[PDB]
Design a protein around this ligand. Structure first.
Ligand code: LEV
Length: 284
């Protein structure tokens, strides 16, 4: 275990004041932290940051995984609407990967806590637009998410949506095994991805369809009370979820377009961004 230094991102450990943990192990031992002078221009400023690290009893393969994650972020590059890499502590101690902090939790929790401040109809659509922008970027950089969901969209102090866990490789996951927090991850998967193991930017758009439904149900659980075996039957039968209560016909049509049985007929993020752009413009 000897990691190579990268002076682009390298940060001294003495510049990193660690803090309370974040988000229930959902992202693999993350903590709140305070980085003293990330920006070498203003070196006397603290910045609130998130810091992922390896677990108490992590394996040699877990380290391999965490490095790939770090390098992935390096390559993909910066965008407002994704979790950006800020730095890392690689030398003379455990690996710390420092990323942008998102004060107001994930999107599911964010929406649930703000059920009836209010979110204007505009806020919700604005929020959906932002995720589409973030996904357009990732798509432009050949990056397939594979698990796009409100659970993996974080929200900042400034209410900016930041996509997380995009990329994060692996290779036949168990459909039946749940998120121990209380979630069945297969319900976001497109049929081609679910059945045939074929992940594409189109399969992500299917998931974005489900994410839209999540938004306009203020953190609603999709296919509630439907076990795995039943979900298979439903998707096979061409079943699609009902329109949310607070959700226009235009937006529901967008969901349905995202849930088009034929992958190539689904709209691209590029298109979704443009449509959402226009729709945000006309909303209270
Ligand atoms: C308070 O809520 C959170 C804020 C967070 N802010 C930043 C990063 C977080 O966690 C993450 C979330 C994701 C990643 N990693 C990636 O996004 N990696 C990308 C390349 C695959 C990392 Cl390091 C840390 C946060 C998690 C929570 C929370 N309640 O769970």
């Amino acid at each position: 275990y000897e990691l190579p230094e990268d002076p682009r991102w390298e940060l001294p450990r003495d510049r990193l004041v660690l803090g309370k943990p974040l988000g229930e192990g959902a992202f693999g031992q993350v903590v709140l932290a305070e980085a003293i002078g990330l920006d070498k221009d203003k070196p006397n400023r603290v910045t609130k940051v998130a810091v992922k690290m390896l677990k108490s009893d992590a394996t040699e393969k877990d380290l391999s995984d965490l490095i790939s994650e770090m390098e992935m972020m390096k390559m993909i590059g910066k965008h407002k609407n994704i979790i950006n890499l800020l730095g890392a502590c690689t030398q003379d101690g455990p690996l710390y990967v420092i990323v942008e902090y998102a004060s107001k939790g994930n999107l599911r929790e964010y929406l649930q806590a703000r059920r009836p401040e209010q979110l204007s109809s505009k806020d919700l659509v604005s929020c959906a637009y932002q995720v589409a922008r973030g996904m357009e970027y990732l798509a432009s950089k050949k990056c397939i998410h594979r698990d796009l969901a409100a659970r993996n969209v974080l929200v900042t102090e400034d209410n900016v949506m930041k996509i997380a866990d995009f990329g994060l490789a692996r290779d036949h996951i168990d459909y039946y095994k749940k998120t121990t927090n209380g979630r069945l991850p297969v319900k976001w998967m497109a049929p081609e991805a679910l059945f045939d193991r074929i992940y594409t930017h189109q399969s992500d758009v299917w998931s974005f369809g489900v994410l839209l439904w999540e938004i306009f149900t203020l953190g609603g659980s999709p296919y509630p009370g439907v076990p795995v075996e039943e979900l298979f039957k439903l998707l096979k039968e061409g079943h699609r979820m009902d329109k949310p209560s607070n959700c226009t016909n235009e937006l529901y049509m967008m969901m349905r377009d995202c849930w088009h049985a034929v992958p190539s007929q689904r709209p691209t993020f590029k298109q979704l961004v443009e449509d959402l752009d226009r729709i945000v413009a006309l909303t209270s």
